[PDB]
Design a binder for this molecule. Structure first.
Ligand SMILES: [K+]
Ligand SMILES: [Mg+2]
Ligand SMILES: [Mg+2]
Ligand SMILES: [Mg+2]
Ligand SMILES: [Mg+2]
Ligand SMILES: [Mg+2]
Ligand SMILES: [Mg+2]
Ligand SMILES: [Mg+2]
Ligand code: NA
Ligand code: NA
Ligand code: NA
Ligand code: NA
Ligand code: NA
Lengths: 254, 212, 118
RNA sequence: UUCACUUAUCGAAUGAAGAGACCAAUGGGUUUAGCGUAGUCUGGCUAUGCACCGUCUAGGUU
RNA sequence: AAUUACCGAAUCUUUGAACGCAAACGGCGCAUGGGAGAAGCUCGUGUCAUCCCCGUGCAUGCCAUAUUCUCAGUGUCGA
RNA sequence: UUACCGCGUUGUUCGGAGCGGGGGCUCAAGAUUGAAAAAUGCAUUGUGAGUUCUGCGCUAAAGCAAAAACCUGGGGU
RNA sequence: CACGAGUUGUUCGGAAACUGAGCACAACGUUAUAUCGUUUUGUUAGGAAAGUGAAGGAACUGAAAAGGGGCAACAGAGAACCUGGGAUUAUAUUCCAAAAAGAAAUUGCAUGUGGG
């Protein structure tokens, strides 16, 4: 047979992201001496929308620590940020929406966003539209903090990694029905070439493991192994369970 | 109308003066590697054969020995050509020095401690000890080369001296044997290396204090 | 060499000896009184050329295809003791370059044409 | 096999842009081993164990 | 000799390994030596700014070298 | 100085964070007077309709490319 | 089919001289094999990639400036000129001659005037 589409997508030829209109990576400040031993103050200059993303972005201006210059950053805005606001980053910062402080200084039971997994990563968790983490506990002996991630899993990170207070903006986005194929067309035109989606049973045997037959059906179970080679790993991959769940919904993940 | 206008160099505040960044700068690769090599040779555990080259002669005795060798330095091209139209010296060169050691002609041997392929002289103290030849290990092959008139030198052997310097040579042999030939068992036994950094040592000391 | 104020090392400034001038690798004799004969080839005798001579004080020449207007003016002055106030050039569809040369009003193109032998 | 170490190795950040100590050892020395005490070793002196000395010096604030 | 044959002296446009930088461009440079220039300046000359033309050198890598060229290193020493 | 009323568009609005009246500063697009220009071209000077550049300032889970080149200021020189 | 002719620019289009989706020289790595890979999300390369302002006592000399060189749009950015001609057999915002039929705009270098 011929190559399957999920394997063709790994060359990334016409399946790469559409990023001409994007503004750049969104990241916190660099963890440097001033942030480790004091605080820095910045001012919010503008709030903008970038194609392909559901949250707002904020342009924040600081002063260069070492030269006579101005430094502009681009972060993901929490809900409530406004232009002309003052933002503090570092150890001696107060507690307010938009301030960046270490997790060891944030009190227990608070709501945070833009969390660093490792100190200096510049923010990798809770960055989509309406997401946030919750601080569960501190442990002064080992210097670690336990959080509840947006998926429900619990993770422990060093107390030296930073986070921003609040919730990401743009919440409630997926609550509106789309109603039209044109709306989906325009949604994915800003992300990548992945829509519309044809069905494996509607393809031919040379193309997909599910294709062929005088009726449209899969001849074999659609639950596949974790050790299957590429091209064979289509369907429900290493599924622990199938069907409609009755009762409480567990967490999904390793 | 002269007055002080002090500057504040705290976090925030005024733009600071140009600080020295030597310790946190990105250097060339060869600089980095040549420093890390010394760090590694300190940290690791060094066998006795290699460690014997770290314990050297004292500065005063090294100065006296190099003075004697300079006094008996060999001839130059100009001097040899001005001669031979009508002397006693040291023996220089690895092959000639080895032959003098293997016979009993040598009366003392000086060995440089920083030869680049160390296998050129690693075996020399063992041979001088198998014979009964007094020997010393000194600080620089560049200094030995300056003594004899070349750029560097790996080793030098004294075979014959004049009566004006016989007493000096005897005292030198005694002082050299005090440090090298008489301590052969300790030399054969002693391992080396295993040094912590100052940072690690201070951390250990602080931890012991806190846990006590 | 003492104190560095930048976070990265950059090659220092050293002494650079300038490149000497070699003996020339050309041996041919070239004459300075000959180049104008290469620049200007020969005139044209068609009806348009004659009309221009009689009406606009203009002469028409076939010139070297790689020459430019400044060189054509200088060669014109050297070969015939006249002053050209304008040169217009075109490259013909057969590959040759043709020039329209207008002389200053102090010179008669008809007299110059008679001297040339047109 | 479980505990500790850091230099091999692995990961991240940065334009390699401010690590640690000075608050003193279970630390280093004949080119920061100088000097005692007690054993052991070959006459120039070492080794082991303990004691003192040098390296070793500053300062916001209370 | 506008004859032939052979060969020792020469000439040898634009390219191409193509190598100053480029290229569906007869394009654009840096250093150095020349040429022409009834602009101006001066006593028909001499001189000449901007513009124009011509010769030579200028790729990367490696080897050797510097009457003993200029440097860099919390590499090893020693003043 | 405005008493929740007043201003304004074909149209979805503006006002003690300054409506309206008097007098002014400025910007954009036009008009007019003249030089060009009659020395040229060929053998008048008024209304109504249509069309551009312009102005009316700036669908959406879709929200309006970048750089050279140039302009103005803050400072020192 | 034969012979003879015809395309004129300081300003028009391009280049000189922009960046885009993109390409891939150097450097490095890989391969028995470079005819392979990375090379714009600020951005080469274990990585020493800057070559000249002001200078002072006519050329030389060297302080301060992280992030190598280049290409890719004749519909994007950029771009100083307009009419009349009785001026061709065929070209013209390209030709016309001292009353330039004429009227302008702009670039480089010089010279006088005024101001400074
Ligand atoms: K390549
Ligand atoms: Mg079918
Ligand atoms: Mg032309
Ligand atoms: Mg070329
Ligand atoms: Mg025909
Ligand atoms: Mg265009
Ligand atoms: Mg043009
Ligand atoms: Mg026609
Ligand atoms: Na199949
Ligand atoms: Na079906
Ligand atoms: Na089915
Ligand atoms: Na690009
Ligand atoms: Na281009």
């Amino acid at each position: 047979g011929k190559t399957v589409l999920s394997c063709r997508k790994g060359n990334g030829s016409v399946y790469q992201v559409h990023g001409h209109k994007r503004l750049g990576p969104a990241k916190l400040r660099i963890l440097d001496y001033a942030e480790r031993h004091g605080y820095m103050r910045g001012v919010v200059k503008s709030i903008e929308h970038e194609a392909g993303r559901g949250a707002a972005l904020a342009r924040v201006e600081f002063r260069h620590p070492y030269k006579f210059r101005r430094v502009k950053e681009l972060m993901v805005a929490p809900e409530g940020m406004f232009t002309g606001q003052s933002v503090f980053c570092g150890q001696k910062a107060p507690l307010a929406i938009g301030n960046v402080l270490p997790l060891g200084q944030i009190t227990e039971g608070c709501i945070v966003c833009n969390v660093e997994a490792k100190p200096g990563d510049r923010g990798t968790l809770a960055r989509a539209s309406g997401d946030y983490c919750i601080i569960i506990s501190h442990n002064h002996e080992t210097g670690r903090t336990r959080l509840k991630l947006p998926s429900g899993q619990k993770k422990s990170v060093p107390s030296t990694s930073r986070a921003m207070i609040g919730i990401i903006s743009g919440g409630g986005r997926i609550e509106k029905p789309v109603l039209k194929a044109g709306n989906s067309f325009y949604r994915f035109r800003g992300k990548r070439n992945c829509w519309p989606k044809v069905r494996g049973v509607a393809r031919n045997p040379v193309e997909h493991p599910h294709g062929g037959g005088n009726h449209q059906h899969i001849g074999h179970p659609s639950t596949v192994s974790r050790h299957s080679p590429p091209g064979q790993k289509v369907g429900l991959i290493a599924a622990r369970r199938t069907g409609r769940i009755r009762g409480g919904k567990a967490v999904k993940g390793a | 109308h002269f007055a002080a206008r002090p500057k504040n160099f705290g976090i925030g505040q005024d733009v600071p003066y140009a600080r020295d960044l030597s310790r946190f700068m990105r250097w060339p690769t060869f600089v980095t590697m040549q420093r890390k090599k010394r760090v590694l040779q300190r940290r690791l555990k060094v066998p006795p054969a290699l460690n014997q080259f770290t314990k050297v002669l004292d500065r005063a005795s090294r100065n006296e020995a190099l003075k004697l060798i300079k006094k008996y330095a060999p001839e130059t091209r100009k001097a040899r050509r001005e001669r031979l139209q009508k002397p006693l010296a040291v023996v220089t060169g690895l092959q000639e020095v080895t032959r003098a050691i293997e016979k009993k002609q040598a009366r003392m041997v000086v060995i440089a401690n920083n030869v680049d392929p160390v296998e050129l002289v690693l075996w020399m103290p063992n041979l001088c000890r198998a014979n009964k030849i007094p020997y010393a290990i000194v600080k620089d092959m560049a200094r030995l080369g300056d003594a004899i008139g070349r750029k560097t030198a790996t080793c030098v052997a004294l075979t014959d001296v004049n009566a004006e310097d016989e007493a000096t040579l005897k005292n030198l042999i005694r002082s050299v044997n005090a440090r090298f030939l008489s301590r052969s068992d300790v030399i054969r036994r002693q391992w080396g290396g295993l040094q912590l950094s100052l940072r690690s040592r201070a951390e250990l000391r602080k931890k012991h204090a806190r846990n006590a | 060499r003492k104190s560095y104020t930048r976070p990265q090392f950059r090659r220092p400034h050293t002494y650079r000896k300038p490149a000497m001038a070699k003996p020339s690798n050309r041996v041919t004799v070239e004459s300075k009184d000959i180049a104008a004969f290469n620049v200007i080839r020969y005139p044209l005798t068609t009806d348009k050329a004659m009309k221009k001579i009689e009406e606009n004080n203009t002469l028409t020449f076939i010139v070297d295809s790689r020459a430019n207007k400044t060189e054509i003016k200088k060669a014109m002055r050297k070969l015939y003791q006249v002053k050209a106030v304008k040169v217009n050039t075109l490259i013909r569809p057969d590959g040759l370059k043709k020039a329209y040369i207008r002389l200053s009003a102090a010179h008669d193109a008809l007299d110059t044409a008679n001297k040339i032998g047109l």
